[PDB]
Design a binder for these strands. Structure first.
Ligand SMILES: [K+]
Ligand SMILES: [Mg+2]
Ligand SMILES: [Mg+2]
Ligand SMILES: [Zn+2]
Ligand SMILES: [Zn+2]
Ligand SMILES: [Zn+2]
Length: 144
RNA sequence: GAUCUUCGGAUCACUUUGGUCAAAUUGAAACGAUACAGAGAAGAUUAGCAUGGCCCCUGCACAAGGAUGACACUGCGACAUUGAGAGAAAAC
């Protein structure tokens, strides 16, 4: 993950996108330091937020604007700058706007069911449109 | 929203919330100190191992320690009464 001055030089298309990744890292640090205003699980929601956003940025670089070479993209996934499993989920129908990967797997729930965010809002009542407790998600379903 | 399909629709996904319990006087324990006595076995100094359980503490322990860890170690009536006398009473 961490790169030294004497490490192998990343592929060519890296430097122009290096600064924004640096900004992502900076704010992740700030979120780590920032404390208060939530329950034991709510304070850990913004982490997944930024993480999904960062992975989506890389996904947008490759699959929507073809701004990065395939070599650089494999390098980025190998350096954990993006979550390979989350991107794999984004590449199949029904999970285009997946929030995180803990809201899809059923072994982490009380009754073996996915999260509320995975459910389309059309069949969900108006009153029970609440923030996810896993990551604060406000609706994953591809329809919305 | 993506995919087809023919502008009828079909696919793809589909219900969270670990809760000694709401931002700390008044529902997570157990005591400091001061004041009193103040160290087992029939004189005195003193080794210990035990018995009993709504007494525990240290210990990983079915070792061993904590004053021999401490407290306790007793005691009574399924007694049948007649054996006899005396004054009274009621009775040989
Ligand atoms: K002694
Ligand atoms: Mg002993
Ligand atoms: Mg003893
Ligand atoms: Zn979600
Ligand atoms: Zn999630
Ligand atoms: Zn969720």
């Amino acid at each position: 993950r961490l790169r030294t001055s004497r490490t192998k030089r990343p592929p060519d298309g890296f430097d122009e996108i290096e600064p924004t990744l640096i900004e992502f890292q900076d704010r992740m640090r700030q979120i780590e330091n920032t404390m208060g205003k939530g329950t034991k699980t709510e304070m850990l929601a913004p982490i997944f937020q930024l993480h999904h956003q960062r992975s989506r940025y890389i996904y947008d670089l490759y699959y929507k604007r073809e701004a990065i070479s395939t070599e650089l993209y494999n390098w980025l996934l190998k350096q954990n700058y993006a979550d390979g499993n989350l991107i794999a989920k984004w590449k199949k129908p029904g999970y285009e706007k997946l929030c995180c990967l803990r809201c899809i797997q059923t072994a982490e729930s009380k009754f073996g069911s996915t999260c509320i965010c995975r459910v389309p809002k059309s069949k969900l009542d108006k009153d029970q449109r609440v923030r996810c407790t896993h990551c604060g998600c406000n609706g994953c379903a591809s329809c919305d």
